[PDB]
Design a protein around this motif. Sequence first.
Motif, PDB file in Angstrom:
ATOM      1  N   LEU A  37       0.941  61.716  78.442  1.00  0.00           N
ATOM      2  CA  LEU A  37       2.007  61.200  78.549  1.00  0.00           C
ATOM      3  C   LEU A  37       1.960  59.611  79.036  1.00  0.00           C
ATOM      4  CD1 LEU A  37       5.097  60.834  77.981  1.00  0.00           C
ATOM      5  CD2 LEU A  37       5.746  62.573  80.447  1.00  0.00           C
ATOM      6  N   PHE A  38       1.425  60.307  80.981  1.00  0.00           N
ATOM      7  CA  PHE A  38       1.641  58.816  81.640  1.00  0.00           C
ATOM      8  C   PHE A  38       0.574  58.892  81.142  1.00  0.00           C
ATOM      9  CE2 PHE A  38       1.957  62.821  84.873  1.00  0.00           C
ATOM     10  CZ  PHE A  38       3.579  62.353  84.956  1.00  0.00           C
ATOM     11  N   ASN A  39      -0.740  58.437  80.525  1.00  0.00           N
ATOM     12  CA  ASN A  39      -2.051  57.994  80.247  1.00  0.00           C
ATOM     13  C   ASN A  39      -1.362  56.716  79.070  1.00  0.00           C
ATOM     14  OD1 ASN A  39      -4.147  58.628  81.526  1.00  0.00           O
ATOM     15  ND2 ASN A  39      -4.746  60.320  79.974  1.00  0.00           N
ATOM     16  N   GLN A  52       1.714  51.614  93.185  1.00  0.00           N
ATOM     17  CA  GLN A  52       0.741  52.371  93.078  1.00  0.00           C
ATOM     18  C   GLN A  52       0.757  54.002  92.883  1.00  0.00           C
ATOM     19  OE1 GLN A  52      -2.924  52.389  93.718  1.00  0.00           O
ATOM     20  NE2 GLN A  52      -2.756  54.072  92.516  1.00  0.00           N
ATOM     21  N   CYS A  53       0.726  54.942  91.521  1.00  0.00           N
ATOM     22  CA  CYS A  53       1.240  55.711  90.835  1.00  0.00           C
ATOM     23  C   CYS A  53      -0.162  56.989  91.566  1.00  0.00           C
ATOM     24  CB  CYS A  53       1.144  55.682  89.905  1.00  0.00           C
ATOM     25  SG  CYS A  53       2.346  55.068  89.224  1.00  0.00           S
ATOM     26  N   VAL A  54       0.657  58.389  91.669  1.00  0.00           N
ATOM     27  CA  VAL A  54      -0.183  58.910  92.403  1.00  0.00           C
ATOM     28  C   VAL A  54      -0.752  60.418  91.308  1.00  0.00           C
ATOM     29  CG1 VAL A  54      -1.502  59.981  94.379  1.00  0.00           C
ATOM     30  CG2 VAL A  54      -0.785  57.899  94.430  1.00  0.00           C
ATOM     31  N   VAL A  55      -1.471  61.365  91.080  1.00  0.00           N
ATOM     32  CA  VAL A  55      -1.146  62.507  90.727  1.00  0.00           C
ATOM     33  C   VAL A  55      -2.019  63.601  91.793  1.00  0.00           C
ATOM     34  CG1 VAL A  55      -1.589  64.542  89.076  1.00  0.00           C
ATOM     35  CG2 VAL A  55      -1.064  61.822  88.437  1.00  0.00           C
ATOM     36  N   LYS A  64      -8.824  64.911  86.853  1.00  0.00           N
ATOM     37  CA  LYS A  64      -9.597  63.882  87.637  1.00  0.00           C
ATOM     38  C   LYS A  64     -10.265  63.696  86.189  1.00  0.00           C
ATOM     39  CE  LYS A  64     -12.590  60.777  89.313  1.00  0.00           C
ATOM     40  NZ  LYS A  64     -12.328  60.189  90.400  1.00  0.00           N
ATOM     41  N   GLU A  65     -10.831  64.697  85.434  1.00  0.00           N
ATOM     42  CA  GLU A  65     -10.996  64.428  83.905  1.00  0.00           C
ATOM     43  C   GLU A  65     -10.444  63.971  83.145  1.00  0.00           C
ATOM     44  OE1 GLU A  65     -13.558  64.064  82.262  1.00  0.00           O
ATOM     45  OE2 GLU A  65     -14.275  65.440  80.837  1.00  0.00           O
ATOM     46  N   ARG A  66      -9.540  64.216  83.083  1.00  0.00           N
ATOM     47  CA  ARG A  66      -8.015  63.572  82.086  1.00  0.00           C
ATOM     48  C   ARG A  66      -7.419  62.134  82.394  1.00  0.00           C
ATOM     49  NH1 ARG A  66      -7.976  65.871  78.050  1.00  0.00           N
ATOM     50  NH2 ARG A  66      -6.171  64.660  77.218  1.00  0.00           N
ATOM     51  N   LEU A  67      -7.398  62.541  83.184  1.00  0.00           N
ATOM     52  CA  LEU A  67      -6.279  61.118  84.048  1.00  0.00           C
ATOM     53  C   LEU A  67      -6.863  59.740  83.986  1.00  0.00           C
ATOM     54  CD1 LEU A  67      -3.269  60.134  84.920  1.00  0.00           C
ATOM     55  CD2 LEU A  67      -4.818  59.942  87.605  1.00  0.00           C
ATOM     56  N   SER A  68      -6.712  58.402  83.731  1.00  0.00           N
ATOM     57  CA  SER A  68      -7.308  57.471  82.866  1.00  0.00           C
ATOM     58  C   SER A  68      -6.663  56.449  83.064  1.00  0.00           C
ATOM     59  CB  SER A  68      -7.299  57.145  81.385  1.00  0.00           C
ATOM     60  OG  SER A  68      -8.668  56.246  81.397  1.00  0.00           O
ATOM     61  N   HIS A  69      -4.934  56.362  83.254  1.00  0.00           N
ATOM     62  CA  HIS A  69      -4.433  55.071  83.869  1.00  0.00           C
ATOM     63  C   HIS A  69      -4.618  54.031  84.329  1.00  0.00           C
ATOM     64  CE1 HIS A  69      -0.552  52.310  84.146  1.00  0.00           C
ATOM     65  NE2 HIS A  69      -0.141  53.131  82.755  1.00  0.00           N
ATOM     66  N   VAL A  97       7.769  59.233  84.618  1.00  0.00           N
ATOM     67  CA  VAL A  97       7.833  58.455  84.289  1.00  0.00           C
ATOM     68  C   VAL A  97       9.279  57.031  84.952  1.00  0.00           C
ATOM     69  CG1 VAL A  97       8.675  56.715  81.929  1.00  0.00           C
ATOM     70  CG2 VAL A  97       6.562  58.957  81.828  1.00  0.00           C
ATOM     71  N   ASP A  98      10.376  57.968  84.717  1.00  0.00           N
ATOM     72  CA  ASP A  98      12.021  56.827  85.058  1.00  0.00           C
ATOM     73  C   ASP A  98      12.017  57.060  86.558  1.00  0.00           C
ATOM     74  OD1 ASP A  98      12.460  56.596  82.436  1.00  0.00           O
ATOM     75  OD2 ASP A  98      14.096  58.413  82.429  1.00  0.00           O
ATOM     76  N   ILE A  99      10.841  58.074  87.224  1.00  0.00           N
ATOM     77  CA  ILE A  99      10.258  57.874  88.808  1.00  0.00           C
ATOM     78  C   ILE A  99       9.849  57.051  89.091  1.00  0.00           C
ATOM     79  CG2 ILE A  99      10.114  58.918  90.848  1.00  0.00           C
ATOM     80  CD1 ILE A  99      11.128  61.172  89.930  1.00  0.00           C
ATOM     81  N   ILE A 100       8.566  56.682  88.231  1.00  0.00           N
ATOM     82  CA  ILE A 100       7.483  54.860  88.397  1.00  0.00           C
ATOM     83  C   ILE A 100       8.375  53.673  88.069  1.00  0.00           C
ATOM     84  CG2 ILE A 100       5.792  53.938  87.476  1.00  0.00           C
ATOM     85  CD1 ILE A 100       4.858  56.361  87.167  1.00  0.00           C
ATOM     86  N   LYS A 101       9.956  53.808  87.143  1.00  0.00           N
ATOM     87  CA  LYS A 101      10.400  52.937  86.335  1.00  0.00           C
ATOM     88  C   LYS A 101      11.280  52.056  87.906  1.00  0.00           C
ATOM     89  CE  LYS A 101      11.361  53.580  81.997  1.00  0.00           C
ATOM     90  NZ  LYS A 101      12.353  54.085  80.932  1.00  0.00           N
ATOM     91  N   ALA A 102      11.871  53.514  88.182  1.00  0.00           N
ATOM     92  CA  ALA A 102      12.537  53.131  89.743  1.00  0.00           C
ATOM     93  C   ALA A 102      12.237  52.180  90.751  1.00  0.00           C
ATOM     94  CB  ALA A 102      13.208  54.205  89.765  1.00  0.00           C
TER      95      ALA A 102
END
Length: 239
Positions: free
Chosen positions: A26-28, A37-40, A51-56, A232-237
Amino acid sequence: MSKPQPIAAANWKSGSPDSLSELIDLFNSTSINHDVQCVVASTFVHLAMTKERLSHPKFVIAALNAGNADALASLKDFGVNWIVLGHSERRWYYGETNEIVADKVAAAVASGFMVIACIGETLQERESGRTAVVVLTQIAAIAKKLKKADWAKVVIAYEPVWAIGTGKVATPQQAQEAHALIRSWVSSKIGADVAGELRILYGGSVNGKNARTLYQQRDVNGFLAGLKPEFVDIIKATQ
């Protein structure tokens, strides 16, 4: 643009690798229009998947409460350069001292990490008017172990214990007051330059409905929240 770059950090403390994999997809796929700056952040057991899956391009990976020197070195050698230190929670549940977190912050900075340090008061502290003294004691302990130039690597999160996992979010006025108190102390004791550039994030029962009104406050620079679809909505905020 008066505020510094915002941060939105999602924490995955636990849960199925399969449900994580889906959130990362979803995030990608999410287009993000503005500078944030988004952080997981996750515990060690989940880091290899993240580390393997996140690519944004707007996302980085962080370790939650990473551990000792060996652990920081293992993170660095795996390509993880951010850590989250959940001090306000660990002070409550475990009695972690302010000096222990301050030494952890300085060790991480010395090893090249960006560090989100979470500070905040308990329910009883809030009720009795002790918030300012308690929060300021925490920031002063951290500052004691840093030089001025080290603050470029530090992010502070205001995470009052009473708001963590309780569904009781700080009101905009409460978050603003705490964030201003921290910033003004940094301005006075460290410098106005540092204070202006410092990101102070709010955490504790943030969700997709309350984040935007929190972000509109002058001294709020983003959020810590759970890793859920509403992030996703927290990022938009943070626009």
